[PDB]
From a paper:
The ORM/ORMDL family proteins function as regulatory subunits of the serine palmitoyltransferase (SPT) complex, which is the initiating and rate-limiting enzyme in sphingolipid biosynthesis. In humans, the heterotrimeric SPT core enzymatic complex, composed of SPTLC1, SPTLC2 or SPTLC3, and SPTssa or SPTssb, catalyzes the first and rate-limiting step of de novo sphingolipid biosynthesis by condensation of serine and palmitoyl-CoA to generate 3-keto-dihydrosphingosine (3-KDS). As a critical mechanism for the homeostatic regulation of sphingolipid production, SPT activity is inhibited in response to elevated cellular sphingolipid levels in an ORM/ORMDL-dependent manner. In this work, we demonstrate that ceramide binds directly with and inhibits the human SPT-ORMDL complexes, a process that is important for establishing cellular sphingolipid homeostasis.
To investigate how ORMDL3 N-terminal mutations release SPT inhibition by ORMDL3 and disturb C6-ceramide-mediated SPT-ORMDL3 inhibition, we determined the structure of SPT-ORMDL3 variant bearing ORMDL3-ΔN2 mutation at an overall resolution of 3.1 Å for the monomeric complex. Although the overall structure of ORMDL3-ΔN2 mutant is closely identical to that of the WT complex, the N-terminal segment of ORMDL3-ΔN2 is disordered, rather than inserted into the substrate binding site as it is in the WT structure. This supports a vital role of Asn2 in stabilizing the ORMDL3 N-terminus. The fixed N-terminus of ORMDL3 in the WT SPT-ORMDL3 complex presumably prevents the binding of palmitoyl-CoA to the enzyme. This is supported by the increased Khalf for palmitoyl-CoA in the ORMDL3-containing complex, whereas the flexible N-terminus of ORMDL3-ΔN2 would permit substrate binding, thus liberating SPT from ORMDL3 inhibition. In addition to the dissimilarities at the ORMDL3 N-terminus, the ceramide-like density sandwiched between ORMDL3 and SPTLC2 in the WT complex was largely diminished in the ORMDL3-ΔN2 mutant, suggesting that this mutation weakens ceramide binding. In line with this, the ORMDL3-ΔN2 mutation causes some local conformational changes for the residues near the ceramide binding pocket, especially Asn13 of ORMDL3, which would be expected to affect ceramide binding. Accordingly, the ceramide-enrichment from the purified ORMDL3-ΔN2 mutant was approximately 25% lower than that of the WT complex. The Asn2 of ORMDL3 forms a hydrogen bond with the main chain of Leu330 in SPTLC1. Mutation of Asn2 of ORMDL3 to alanine achieved effects similar to that of the ORMDL3 N-terminal deletion mutants, supporting the importance of the polar interaction between ORMDL3 N-terminus and SPTLC1. The remaining 75% may largely represent ceramide, along with other membrane lipids, bound to the detergent micelles in the isolated complex, or, some other potential ceramide binding sites in the complex. These results suggest that there is an important interplay between the N-terminus of ORMDL3 and the ceramide binding site.
Numbering used by the authors:
A (entry chain C): 9 to 56
B (entry chain D): 11 to 153
C (entry chain B): 45 to 546
D (entry chain E): 10 to 47
E (entry chain A): 51 to 473
């Protein structure tokens, strides 16, 4: 479960080329991607 | 020189269309923004980005193939060795025109939303002409 | 006999290769990585412009700030935003004789591959698949180590003069006569650098008013020699006989560009094997085309001399053709004989002319005696002149290993480029982060390979090269093929649509 | 988007002219050769 | 236009020139003199025992037992040749030691080594000079510099030999063109390619008054001390130590390990800001195999010997200035070269007429000198392909192995055949 879930994060790190980035550059991308999705649900709910 | 031959790579047209499609989804998600101005922002941002990336930056990101013979040409002038009307140079001209009809139509042809898109479309169309290939107005970004 | 082409080229044996195209979903997902890297590189330049201290990279002297800037900031954009990030697996230093088992000096970085620092520990016993060691002549004990040690005691480390001056020994005269017997030509000449054989002899043949039909994927030395010659250059598609034959028509019925005068002569530059895109050239069709348009040929076989052919004579023996149909025949001693230097072979009228009008023969120093003697002793073993059977075994073993090793990768689901008989096996891995992951994983599993990027190949065609050898055993190949399978499953590198059936 | 076609019918006449000119420009450059700039 | 019959009629009529021109006349060369054994102090040329004044080992070191012992050990540990281009498992741990050792010897910051002496300066110049650049080069430069300048498609403006007035006059004119286009003169770099102790004339270049021009006209210097490395100065560091110039004012220094180190290869030294660029840009360093380890182990030991005994340069120069005094008086030959250079020339006074007659005339003194016991050679050039072709001459090279009596015999033996051929 957890071990098999870590492999998916590993595969996510290679597709987006986040594997070869500094740790402080990973946080920026992760936050900037979570915020977009989070504000794409508030709008979806208020427009339904 | 695999820089002038990047717009021939397998799946770059489809990966370029999806980029514009994704730009229109992060803009549509803003909690309080009307649809016409969303469409106007999409077109303006795409045109500004394409103008910067195709008609402003001169040179290669890597060491130049020849002894620096491409250091004074934008990415549009060196595309396909400067040979006009290739397959990609038709696509890159038709795309911002087709994207203009949609933003004219979704704005219900408002009088104030036509003086922004037209001035934007013209700016990314004038430089694509065969006569302006190598010309530099006044001296703006000559060297 | 086997099959014929419209040109006239005759193949005696089947000639087949595969260049499977990248799948669409994989092609789209690499542009995401490249765009992310570009965006973060821009955000890094601006941040390092004035904020980040970056007290590492050296700058210009305090007294030379008034001068014009030496370099261009945007010139080396990819060198410090892409390549640099994963450049921890390129200049790996070794500390042993390289073949089939190498020792590597361990090193680790603290500031993200900006300044390495050696620890002191040595990774002993690493399967080597990154150095050109066909026929396995790169060793430190054998019959060739005695001949090079005896000649190094009664001569020296090097000569101190030029061929036309007092720096022409009898060792060179002995070597140049034996190379001719090896290849099957009238005469030959030896130089002392493979790169300086192309860039210092091509300009002596053609000049202003001549045409060069160069190939798409030629080596750097060929291009540099062509540019120094002073002639017009036209590139045709890689290994396309319908594109090279169309360029030979418009070059004759249209003459020179402006004056529309006839060309003085037309020269064709090709190679036996292209290393990156491991593939063989179609000599029957290329020779059929030079006989119909009266062109000249210049074959460069550095990766095929000793690696192909039933006896190790190159591609000309691999096909069965006449070695007298090729005007100029280049090679190198540094990829199959475990030595250094180059050579050119051909007619006696051409070597006699190169002996006086070549930049190397008059301005550069000669070969060294200790390295010349090893070439002689080694090339006497392929011929079987030593009185043993250490020339057939290695030749037969290399082909055996290549045939066994390529089919096993085909049957696992990877994507392999090139002809079915080439000893260079490029694996395909398109993502720009899998380049950095593959080297790290392979070295962690005691296997040394080489990876190529975007400045050397096309945008979405990254790969890993797997130069084989005749010193590899069956056990070493099974061991290497095991960890490659586990790593390919871990990184999901099996893109083959039509996996081969065992 | 029901009012959009209604607006299109009421759209100013000078804007459809430009639209038609662009449509003609897209068809004029779609049937051209290649001619290297020499 | 041009139907398929005209097209095939034009293809059957074309006739190319042969790949090599037929010999129009008997060439002066094409007679490589064979050397039996090593080209040492007492060699055997064309089956005759004779002392050589032709090899370029100024310090001996070619038949030094200490140097051969240090190469045998690295031979029996590493093999003979590398199998890769220094970027694919081609870099050993002896290359790093040699590169670290050279920088310490030159008191510079970093070093880079090539595997061929000709390609070190023909690959360095085009790495820094580009299309829109201006290069001021001395008129009597060697062939490698010419090739490097041709590769770098840049503007080339050559001045006279050893006159600062012409260089300054040349630089002042370029200063005018800046005023006529200020926005273009801010993206063009300027270089001054100078070679200390020219091999084509045997003269030393003046640095003290050439460094001043760099700080007044903003132009960088490229030194090429490939013939003064290990010869000039109190410690054998070159011409910078000879004059007393700070090493940091030069920008880049190039030499080869084929003359004083008696090995194969070349190197470049300089600050770490300028040397680290050509690890990815130098054509001959990236796309080429690396130097064999036994050769590098021979250069390290030669460096050890030079560092341990710094009094060998004085005894080199003392007997270098001893034969340059006994060669004054030859009826017909004039000595061209400095009183300190170890390889000067011997031109022909009152030239006959054509270029071929002088070559034959000189080849008469060389052939006659070999009958006695003095091996000489004459300078060789590519007459068709060269900017400024020097006159015919006979090289005279001086090492530390030759005794003083031997030098006197050479000087007196080269005068008796010179006043009996040109008379």
């Amino acid at each position: 479960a957890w071990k098999q879930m870590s492999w998916f994060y590993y595969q996510y790190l290679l597709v987006t080329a986040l594997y070869m980035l500094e740790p402080w550059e990973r946080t920026v991308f992760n936050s900037m991607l979570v915020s977009i999705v989070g504000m794409a649900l508030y709008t979806g709910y208020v427009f339904m | 020189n695999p820089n002038t031959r990047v717009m021939n790579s397998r799946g770059i047209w489809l990966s370029y269309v999806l980029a514009i499609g994704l730009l229109h989804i992060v803009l549509l998600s803003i909690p309080f923004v009307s649809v016409p101005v969303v469409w106007t922002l999409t077109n303006l941002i795409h045109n500004m980005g394409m103008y910067i990336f195709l008609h402003t930056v001169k040179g290669t990101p890597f060491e130049t193939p020849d002894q620096g013979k491409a250091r004074l040409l934008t990415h549009w002038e060196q595309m396909d060795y400067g040979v006009q009307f290739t397959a990609s140079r038709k696509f890159l001209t038709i795309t911002p025109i087709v994207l203009y009809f949609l933003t004219s139509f979704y704005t219900k042809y408002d009088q104030i939303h036509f003086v922004l898109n037209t001035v934007s479309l013209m700016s990314v169309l004038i430089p694509k002409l065969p006569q302006l290939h190598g010309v530099r107005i006044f001296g703006i970004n000559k060297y | 006999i086997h099959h014929v082409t419209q040109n006239g080229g005759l193949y005696k044996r089947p000639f087949n290769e595969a260049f499977e195209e990248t799948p669409m979903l994989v092609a789209v997902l690499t542009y995401v990585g490249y765009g992310v890297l570009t965006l973060f590189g821009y955000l890094r330049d601006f941040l390092r412009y004035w904020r980040i201290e970056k007290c590492h990279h050296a700058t210009e002297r305090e007294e030379q700030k008034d001068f014009v800037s030496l370099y261009q900031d945007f010139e080396n954009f990819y060198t410090r935003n892409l390549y640099m990030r994963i450049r921890d697996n390129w200049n790996r230093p070794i500390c042993s004789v390289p073949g089939a088992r190498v020792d590597i000096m361990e090193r680790q970085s603290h500031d993200y591959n900006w300044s390495f620092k050696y620890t002191g520990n040595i990774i002993k016993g690493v399967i080597n698949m990154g150095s050109y060691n066909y026929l396995g002549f790169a060793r430190n004990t054998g019959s060739c180590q005695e001949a090079a040690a005896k000649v190094l005691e009664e001569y020296g480390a090097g000569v101190c003069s030029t061929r036309q001056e007092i720096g022409n020994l009898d060792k060179h005269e002995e070597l140049e006569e034996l190379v001719a017997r090896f290849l099957g030509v009238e005469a030959a000449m030896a130089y002392g650098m493979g790169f300086a054989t192309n860039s210092m002899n091509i300009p002596a043949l053609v000049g202003k008013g001549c045409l060069i039909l160069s190939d798409e994927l030629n080596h750097a030395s060929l291009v540099l020699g062509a540019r120094l010659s002073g002639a017009t250059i036209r590139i045709f598609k890689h290994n396309n006989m319908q594109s090279l034959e169309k360029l030979l028509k418009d070059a004759i019925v249209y003459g020179q560009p402006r004056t529309r005068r006839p060309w003085k002569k037309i020269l064709i530059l090709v190679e036996g094997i292209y290393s990156m895109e491991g593939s063989i050239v179609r000599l029957p069709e290329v020779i059929a085309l030079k006989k119909k348009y009266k062109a000249y040929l210049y074959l460069d076989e550095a990766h095929s001399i000793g690696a192909l052919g039933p006896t190790g004579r190159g591609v000309v023996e691999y096909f069965g053709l006449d070695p007298e149909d090729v005007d100029v025949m280049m090679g190198t001693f540094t990829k199959s004989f475990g030595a250094s230097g180059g050579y050119i072979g051909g007619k006696k009228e051409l070597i006699d002319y190169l002996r006086t009008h070549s930049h190397s023969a008059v301005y550069a120093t000669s070969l060294s005696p200790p390295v010349v003697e090893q070439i002689i002793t080694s090339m006497k073993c392929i011929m079987g002149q030593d009185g043993t059977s250490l020339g057939k075994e290695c030749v037969q073993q290399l082909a055996e290993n290549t045939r066994y090793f390529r089919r096993r990768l085909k049957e696992m689901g990877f994507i392999i480029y090139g002809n079915e008989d080439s000893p260079v096996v490029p694996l395909m891995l398109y993502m720009p982060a899998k380049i950095g992951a593959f080297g790290r994983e392979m070295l962690k599993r005691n296997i040394g390979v080489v990876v190529v990027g975007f400045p050397a190949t096309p945008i979405i065609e990254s790969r890993a090269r797997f130069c084989l050898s005749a010193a590899h055993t069956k056990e070493i190949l099974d061991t290497a093929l095991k960890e490659i399978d586990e790593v390919g499953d871990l990184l999901q590198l099996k893109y083959s649509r039509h996996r081969l059936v065992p | 988007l029901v009012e959009m076609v209604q607006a299109l019918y009421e759209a100013p006449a000078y804007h459809l002219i430009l639209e038609g000119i662009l449509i003609l420009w897209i068809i004029r450059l779609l049937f051209s050769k290649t001619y290297k700039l020499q | 236009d041009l139907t398929v019959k005209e097209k095939e009629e034009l293809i059957e009529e074309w006739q190319p020139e042969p790949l090599v021109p037929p010999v129009p006349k008997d060439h002066p060369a094409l007679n490589y003199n064979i050397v039996s054994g090593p080209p040492s102090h007492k060699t055997v040329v064309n089956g005759k025992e004779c002392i050589n004044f032709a090899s370029f080992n100024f310090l001996g070191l070619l038949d030094n037992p200490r140097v051969k012992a240090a190469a045998l050990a690295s031979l029996k540990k590493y093999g003979v040749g590398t199998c890769g281009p220094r970027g694919f498992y081609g870099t050993f741990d002896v290359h790093l030691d040699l590169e670290d050792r050279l920088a310490k010897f030159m008191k510079t910051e970093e070093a880079i080594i090539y595997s061929y002496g000709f390609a070190t300066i023909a690959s360095a110049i085009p790495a820094y000079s580009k299309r829109g650049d201006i290069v001021f080069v001395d008129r009597a430069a060697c062939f490698a510099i010419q090739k490097g300048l041709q590769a770098s498609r840049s503007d080339i403006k050559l001045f006279k030999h050893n006159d600062m007035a012409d260089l300054e006059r040349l630089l002042k004119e370029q200063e005018i063109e800046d005023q006529k286009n200020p926005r273009k003169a801010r993206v063009t770099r300027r270089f001054i390619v100078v070679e200390g102790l020219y091999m084509n004339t045997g003269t030393i270049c003046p640095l003290p008054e050439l460094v001043k021009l760099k700080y007044k006209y903003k132009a960088r210097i490229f030194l090429e001390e490939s013939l003064s490395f290990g010869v000039l100065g109190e410690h054998g560091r070159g011409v910078t130590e000879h004059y007393g110039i700070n090493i940091d004012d030069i920008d880049l220094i190039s030499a080869n390990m084929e003359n004083a180190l008696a090995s194969i290869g070349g190197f470049c030294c300089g600050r770490s800001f300028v040397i680290d660029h050509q690890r990815l840009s130098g054509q001959g360093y990236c796309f080429s195999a690396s130097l064999p380890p036994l050769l590098a182990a021979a250069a390290i030991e030669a460096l050890n010997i030079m560092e341990e005994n710094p009094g060998i340069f004085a005894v080199l120069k003392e007997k270098c200035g001893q034969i340059h005094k006994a060669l004054q008086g030859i009826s017909g030959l004039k000595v061209v070269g400095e009183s300190l250079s170890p390889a000067f020339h011997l031109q022909l006074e009152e030239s006959t007429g054509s270029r071929e007659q002088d070559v034959r005339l000189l080849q008469e003194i060389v052939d006659q000198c070999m009958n006695r016991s003095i091996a000489l050679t004459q300078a060789r050039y590519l007459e068709k392909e060269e900017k400024c072709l020097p006159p015919p001459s006979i090289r005279v090279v001086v090492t530390v192995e030759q005794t003083e009596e031997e030098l006197e015999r050479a000087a007196s033996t080269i005068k008796e055949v010179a006043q009996a051929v040109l008379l």
